[PDB]
Design a protein around this ligand. Structure first.
Ligand SMILES: Cc1cc2nc3c(=O)[nH]c(=O)nc-3n(C[C@H](O)[C@H](O)[C@H](O)COP(=O)(O)OP(=O)(O)OC[C@H]3O[C@@H](n4cnc5c(N)ncnc54)[C@H](O)[C@@H]3O)c2cc1C
Ligand SMILES: Cc1cc2nc3c(=O)[nH]c(=O)nc-3n(C[C@H](O)[C@H](O)[C@H](O)COP(=O)(O)OP(=O)(O)OC[C@H]3O[C@@H](n4cnc5c(N)ncnc54)[C@H](O)[C@@H]3O)c2cc1C
Ligand SMILES: O=c1ccn([C@@H]2O[C@H](COP(=O)(O)OP(=O)(O)O[C@H]3O[C@H](CO)[C@H](O)[C@H](O)[C@H]3O)[C@@H](O)[C@H]2O)c(=O)[nH]1
Ligand SMILES: O=c1ccn([C@@H]2O[C@H](COP(=O)(O)OP(=O)(O)O[C@H]3O[C@H](CO)[C@H](O)[C@H](O)[C@H]3O)[C@@H](O)[C@H]2O)c(=O)[nH]1
Lengths: 361, 365
């Protein structure tokens, strides 16, 4: 048999599969999807363009440890993602910065001046709890309306006041002129795509890969010691406490007969269209092609779980599940879905590494 | 008694495995298809390289068949790009057509024979053979010693490490000799490449919920604890029976892939080198895939003794060794052998598919 049965071949499951196997363990990693990599899986479309079938996946981290780790399995294309937001018929920097405010209102404030201007408009909040509070308390009611309110309502189906502060706190507000989506120390894409990096990661002879397979389809007749489950929690426990909310997305992919379609990798639509944004994969990968491929993101209530929904009622409901999980003797939970945390890739990696260390000492 | 488990454990994700998996699953059987490699499709696997060029890591794979049955079957899993492969052979510093034909003869010897003449020409140089048995017989008896030496003897010696006389007639008889001006490598009814590659086609083929795909796994690593009713084996026969009769010869290959900053390196899909270099041939994938790209990627093939089994070696000595293993296989109760490696048959893609499909109809009987 195996020492470990890992459910989910994304970062959480693949990072652990790699570490355990590098330390002698015999690992069987399985996934219900026909491919590995989970959400970060990438492949070439019919036109021969490299794309992310599950939406834009830009790698960024502040962890020297995380970056040096991945570096063992892939070279890097230096890349700092940038996003424009379609507001009032323009394409403006988001996160909001000096340039956003100046171009929108036709002002000419310096950075020093825009700090006072924000001050003069930000609503005061006794205690910031909601996604509305974080933004409104920093940059006033108007900017909140034009950049965050609409987008949030469309993405989650919930007003920012029905969401925890951490959600819209992901996008910081700047008084400077930095226009990168991330100020992280390390920002780079795997030179030949995520999938390629996962294959290196899972190359050990100590790793058996099983695809197109629900773990429940084999758990009964396959000898294993410990289980590492990276799927959704509520599903692991047959939805015993009811359905734990997970927001989902639909992706409509297109290929155009032109080299470039967008000014940058991603354009957000806070106040227009059904989709939240369009992305162009050549901006992100650096691939050269006579054509180009893009993807439109439509928020959905039903579908494969991609987003936990951070808010009081869901935090509580998860705690019920967390209780069962912590009780689950021979099963360790890790990942964005398994532990219900709005995590980026690097964060999942860290959580995985840390989980590996405990399982080791 | 223990678990019932999978109805079928299938070893190999090549055409032999995949076709039986799809057929079995579609019929309602639970299948676990396993392969020691980290990908499906066996030799026919294809992928994009670092440059973004669709290539065949295991050498050039051109699909051709005369079986309508087979073509329509594979058509269920992929659209087609019509392609008719054309090889050139480097002889006397020239690039001449092979199969040998009217143009090959005329251009090589600077002749002006008509089709009707090249027939009399061949007749006049052919060596007679009481009974054709070797690869030397099939050729020499048709186009003569000189053409044989120039197009076959050197190539064959390099590919197999054996003189054509040390190989069965069936080996070189694969390449027809022509009196017409056909320069196609195949004259089959249906010649086309899978529009988006073989891998895409295989994914559709193993996509059923009834099929579980296991990669990076030698069946021996699991056949001890995973329950299964019947096994379909598609690897080398001798290895299945622990070489209890000794190593069955299989020829291997080393592939050297290159990418060049040009649009096109070769006049055709493949160029053969019967009398030059270590490698037997070079191939440019864009000719075969139809892909558009500012660069191009090619593969050189180097015949090898040691390595992964790619070719059975048809000759009396080996046919005699295989026959013993064949009896073992025929005795194997809950084991079905099918494919190029598992039945020791020099088969093309379309042939293996056909053999799998037949195997399936028998299983369903
Ligand atoms: C649209 C989108 C864009 C994103 N962009 C970025 C970005 O730009 N930068 C960034 O850092 N992060 C981004 N992320 C977040 C990033 O994708 C996650 O941090 C990371 O993918 C989480 O990895 P994971 O392994 O924990 O979960 P996953 O990657 O989802 O892997 C979990 C796997 O578990 C499998 N599974 C679940 N249940 C079962 C079961 N029952 N049986 C078998 N298999 C099962 C699933 O099929 C899935 O493949 C983005 C996420 C989304 C949705
Ligand atoms: C260089 C080259 C070029 C070719 N070109 C053409 C062509 O142009 N046109 C054409 O029609 N045909 C071509 N062929 C032939 C074609 O590849 C074969 O007909 C076809 O691939 C045979 O399929 P198969 O499934 O029977 O064997 P394979 O495709 O080899 O699949 C067998 C699989 O079994 C796996 N396996 C074996 N033992 C084990 C084990 N112990 N545990 C787990 N897995 C195991 C192997 O890893 C392998 O993937 C070519 C072959 C080669 C080598
Ligand atoms: O223009 C915006 C952007 C965000 N928000 C709000 O702030 C939240 C967080 O925004 P994220 O971009 O971080 O949310 P995503 O998961 O949808 O985006 C993913 O894709 C992006 C690519 O553009 C980034 O790389 C990001 O880190 C990555 O997790 C949103 O849910 C929303 O409530 C807006 O109101 N307006
Ligand atoms: O120029 C040649 C070609 C062949 N032979 C001899 O005849 C045999 C049969 O030749 P193949 O080309 O058929 O050998 P392969 O299996 O290596 O070829 C594979 O690669 C080819 C790519 O051009 C074709 O697609 C072919 O059908 C495919 O199975 C060779 O082994 C050799 O003995 C030659 O002497 N000279």
């Amino acid at each position: 048999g195996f020492d470990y049965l890992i459910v989910g071949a994304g970062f959480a499951g693949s990072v652990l599969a790699e570490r355990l196997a590098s330390s002698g363990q015999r690992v069987l990693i399985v996934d219900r999807r026909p491919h590995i990599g989970g959400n970060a899986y990438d492949c070439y479309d019919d036109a021969g363009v490299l794309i992310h079938p599950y939406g834009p996946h830009i790698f960024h981290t502040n962890s020297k440890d995380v970056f040096e780790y991945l570096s063992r399995f892939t070279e890097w294309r230096p890349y700092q993602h940038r996003v424009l937001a379609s507001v009032d018929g323009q394409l403006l920097p988001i996160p909001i910065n000096l340039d956003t405010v100046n171009r929108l209102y036709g002002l000419n404030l310096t950075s020093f001046q825009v700090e006072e201007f924000f001050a003069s408009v930000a609503e005061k909040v006794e205690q910031v709890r909601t996604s509305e509070d974080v933004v409104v308390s920093k940059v006033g009611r108007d900017l909140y309306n034009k950049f965050f309110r609409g987008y949030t309502r469309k993405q989650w189906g919930l007003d920012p006041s029905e969401l925890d502060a951490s959600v819209t706190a992901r996008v910081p507000t700047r008084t400077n002129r930095d226009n990168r989506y991330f100020a992280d120390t390390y920002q780079a894409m795997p030179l030949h795509g995520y999938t390629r990096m996962f294959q290196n990661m899972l190359s050990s002879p100590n790793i058996k890969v099983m695809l197109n397979t629900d773990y429940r389809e084999i758990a009964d007749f396959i000898p294993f010691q410990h289980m590492i489950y990276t799927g959704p929690v509520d599903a692991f426990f047959d939805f015993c406490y009811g359905k734990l909310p997970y927001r989902s997305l639909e992706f409509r992919h297109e290929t155009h007969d032109t080299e470039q379609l967008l000014p940058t990798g991603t354009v957000n639509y806070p106040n227009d269209y059904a989709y939240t944004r369009v992305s162009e994969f050549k901006h992100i990968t650096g691939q050269r092609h006579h054509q180009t491929s893009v993807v439109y993101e439509y928020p959905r209530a039903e579908g494969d779980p991609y987003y936990p929904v951070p808010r009081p009622e869901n935090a509580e409901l998860y705690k019920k599940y967390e209780a069962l999980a912590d009780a689950a003797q021979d099963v360790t939970f890790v990942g964005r879905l398994a532990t219900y945390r709005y995590y980026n890739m690097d964060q999942v990696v860290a959580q995985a590494l840390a989980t590996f260390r405990r399982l080791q000492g």
